[model samples]
Target: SRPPSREIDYTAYPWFAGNMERQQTDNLLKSHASGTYLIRERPAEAERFAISIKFNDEVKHIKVVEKDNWIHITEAKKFDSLLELVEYYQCHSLKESFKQLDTTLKYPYKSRE
Candidate 1:
């Protein structure tokens, strides 16, 4: 319904370790807005990932599911390209705000570029 709001409850992958800071990363959820970001490193059993984008002091999470070379946001809503997903959130979610996360640094942040 309406692509679901960013406020969501996602189970963190057990293998996921550490947190993400908005300062060093090069992903959309961090560089675009100022808020806390908590993303899962990978999926537990499925080909999906999860990230929480909090904006305006609000907290939320969205699942990133991979299928047919496309990444679906939630509930099968798919985007052919990452730019399309960026465009959707640029207007939809991150507008009011808010990577795979490189686990090398203290804060694992990935660059969309």
Candidate 2:
């Protein structure tokens, strides 16, 4: 098998959910207080470790962490919230970026193959 490029230590952080991070270059990292990141879901207080979810009272309380590309909701109580976030990004964000990169690298006046 080919060599793995990156590895995760599930022992230190025992959660491998979805969409691992990829390589990026010359990207600006934005600060939180500057509204660089959007609030996808407010935190909700619920029974700890209970997969069955109701309206989380702490939903207003937010926790943002790095997921694949940028800040994301990462609380177990906020699994639905995180899934929404990933879905939103897949629909709205990921494709347009590829388009821009295609335009940059593709020959002028030639459609992307």
Candidate 3:
């Protein structure tokens, strides 16, 4: 589902090319910000497994469970602003990062039918 019209502010976010316009961009962002998006804010509760990425023996990333049959892959790295992750690290580290997430959070035979 999408967010209500009042939640959107188009002036701050412009639309991309192709078929979208300013209003569309505003609506999309509003929906995402309003927690109406399909993506979950936290991990799933039904599963019994969780994983964490340890850097210097401290966890840097984590994935516990997801309602949907999906794994969250965030391109936003905290060392620097996400802009750097999106602009540079994404191209090279994006796939590897998810692979690491999966490996770190792996649950053997944990999928429930």
> Best lDDT goes to which candidate?
1
lDDT of 2 by residue, 6-82 (tens): 43332232222122121110021111111122122223343111111111111112234543433343433222333
Between candidates 1 and 3, the lDDT winner? 1
State each candidate's clash count. Answer: 0, 7, 2
Q: How many angstroms is residue 51 displaced in model 2 relative to the true structure, after the best TM-score fit?
A: 22
The order of the candidates by TM-score, greatest first, is 1, 3, 2
TM-score versus the correct structure, for each prediction: 0.40, 0.18, 0.21
Whole-model lDDT values for every prediction: 0.44, 0.25, 0.29
Best by TM-score: 1
RMSD of each: 13.1, 16.0, 17.5
Task: Residues 28-107, candidate 1: write the lDDT tens digits.
Answer: 44343444444554535674556665454334556666677677665424687544553565434333321332111122
Name the regions of candidate 3 deviating beyond 4 angstroms. Answer: 1-78, 100-113
lDDT, model 3, position 88: 50
How many clashes does the backbone of model 3 have?
2
Report the Cα lDDT for residue 108, model 2.
Answer: 11
Q: Per-residue alpha-carbon lDDT of model 3 for 1-113, expressed as tens digits? A: 66654322322322112233334434433423111111112233563222222222233333333224332334343333222322353235344656543222221111211
